[PDB]
Design a protein around this ligand. Structure first.
Ligand code: MA4
Ligand code: NAG
Ligand code: NAG
Lengths: 88, 50, 79, 216, 76, 50
């Protein structure tokens, strides 16, 4: 159930984020392949960016969020004193 | 289902069929350890940066 | 005089981060280094179904699902 | 139980600068109170101080002939005591008239129901502490699809009155206890049913089925 | 005609200080009948809402093409 | 002195956004990254027809 046959033909990377795996809800870590992943059909995402297994389908939700927060605080306190006395 | 998951399930079924609930539960716990609690049906491929 | 600078960068997916990198370079570099950022799933006993396992009969897979689910319950209760 | 809303009373102890954002009217009443059939519950009262430089210009006239405008800035430490409460159902209140609890979040914490520092769609954030916001739902359907059963609030000094009148710091029934906020070393927590909360990394798709596989 | 094709059944308004008089003269903060309650505005902490039928309101992300048919498929 | 800048960008479809991008580059980059910005449909029972 390898994908090298498709890669030799299409010359594309395989989408490395795939569902159908086990998941340890306690430790929050992937466990093991439960669904069967096959690359018989050499299925591809519509945009032609990744090779996906025949048992998955992708919704293209191409989204980006950017937050930038900058904050500058400056304080300057300057003080001088001059006392002069003279007795003649 | 994958080949390995099916094989483990068949082993548990056979152990239950042998009326041996002792290693049946052990085999089930091994299944839990190897394949975890849930199965992921949907992910979101992406990236993040802070 | 007292200077104190702290930088902290935390990345998930994309090229390994280095300080002199620009968000343009990082954003253009996620073409192959994508990572699962969110996931949803179902309890595995939901997948132990007669139609999903041809090799075994229905009454058997019912008991199989029961014992798997009680194994999960024990695994939860212990921890 | 029925959660009729919250309100944070603000009392100015010096100046009139702090209570312009630390006060929160109750959504249903439009005032620092609770709706009919609800008993206000004292959640927590704490004091807060902040320094500010207020600039003011005044026209001083000496001898009715020497008139001059003088502008001066004063650095004052305004102090205000805020008292936050919450409206619990007094008795067999009409159902489902009230509000729904969509989780709370702070600028440093997360809202585990939505896994985000914001309120879900159709939800309104109400200010409850200096940094705590509560997500309240007006629509009944949107809340019922976006809420969790609520048990009550309690503080480090006043416990939950719905314990099983003694007011202990314990969530009644099968409601779980999770931290909500820490205000000056005082813990504030809430109570939600333990079945809905989980590890949280994997959001389970708990919609159908509503019954286990029915046997032949 | 344009309004009929571009409007929703309306029950009435109410504010935080005065509820809806069409409740079922007492004026309560409740939408009569099957009219749903949705927030309209928050003016200085005062809540103003409206009442519309629950049949038209939905999740809203999918606009229905709910035009014809005006009856379920009639059985043979 | 006190500076406070907040920038927030939210993009649907198109090239992954980065701050230095020009709207020209972004607009010329949607040629393959198009997403559903609006959708209409029918109830499920409407398709279960003889
Ligand atoms: O000045 C020191 C303080 O600076 C900030 O506080 C600010 C505050 O965030 C701002 O809102 C208000 O200034 C407001 C300035 C005008 C207020 C009076 C209105 C005047 C304006 C001119 C015509 C007459 C009326 O107080 C101070 C001084 O900036 C912070 O609290 C903190 O850095 C420090 O405690
Ligand atoms: C470090 O100190 C210098 C003065 O030697 C100052 O100009 C600068 O702002 C300080 N911070 C950094 C990040 O250089
Ligand atoms: C930031 O502060 C500088 C002074 O250091 C000031 O000139 C500028 O207007 C402020 N804002 C931005 C966006 O730079």
């Amino acid at each position: 159930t390898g994908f090298q046959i498709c890669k030799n033909a299409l010359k594309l990377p395989v989408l490395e984020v795939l569902p159908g795996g086990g998941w340890d809800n306690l430790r929050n870590v992937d466990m093991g392949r439960v669904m069967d992943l096959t690359y018989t059909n050499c299925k591809t995402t519509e945009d032609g960016q990744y090779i996906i297994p025949d048992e998955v389908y992708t919704i293209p939700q191409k989204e980006s969020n950017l937050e930038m927060n900058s904050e500058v605080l400056e304080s300057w306190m300057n003080y001088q004193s001059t006392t002069s006395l003279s007795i003649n | 289902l994958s080949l390995g998951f099916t094989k483990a399930l068949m082993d548990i079924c056979d152990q239950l069929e042998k009326n041996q609930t002792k290693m049946a539960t052990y085999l089930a716990e091994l299944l839990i350890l190897n394949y975890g609690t849930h199965v992921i049906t949907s992910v979101d491929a992406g990236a993040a940066l802070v | 005089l007292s200077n104190r600078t702290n930088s902290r960068v935390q990345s998930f997916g994309g090229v390994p981060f280095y300080p002199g990198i620009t968000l343009e370079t990082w954003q253009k570099g996620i073409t192959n280094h994508l990572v699962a950022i969110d996931r949803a799933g179902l309890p595995l006993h939901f997948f132990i179904k007669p139609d999903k396992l041809p090799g075994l009969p229905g009454p058997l897979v019912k008991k199989l699902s029961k014992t798997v689910e009680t194994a999960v319950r024990h695994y939860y209760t212990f921890n | 139980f029925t959660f009729g809303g919250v309100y944070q009373e603000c009392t100015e102890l010096s100046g009139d600068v702090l209570c312009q954002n630390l006060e929160q009217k109750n959504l249903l009443t439009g005032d620092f109170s609770c709706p009919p059939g609800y008993s206000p519950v004292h959640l927590l009262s704490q004091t807060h101080e902040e320094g500010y430089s207020r600039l003011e210009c005044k026209k001083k006239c000496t001898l009715k002939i020497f008139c001059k405008t003088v502008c001066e800035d004063v650095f004052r430490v305004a102090k205000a005591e805020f008292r936050a409460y919450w409206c619990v159902a007094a008795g067999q209140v009409p159902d489902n008239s009230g509000l729904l609890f969509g989780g709370v979040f702070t600028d440093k914490t997360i809202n585990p129901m939505t896994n985000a520092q914001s309120c879900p769609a159709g939800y309104i954030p109400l200010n409850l502490f200096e940094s705590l916001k509560v997500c309240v739902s007006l629509d009944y359907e949107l809340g019922f699809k976006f809420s969790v059963p609520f048990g009550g609030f309690f503080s480090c000094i006043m416990g939950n009155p719905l314990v099983n009148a003694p007011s202990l710091k314990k969530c009644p029934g099968g409601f779980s206890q999770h931290l909500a906020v820490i205000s000056d070393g005082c813990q504030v927590s809430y109570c939600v049913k333990a079945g809905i909360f989980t590890g949280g990394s994997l959001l389970p798709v708990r919609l159908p089925p509503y019954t286990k596989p029915p046997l032949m």
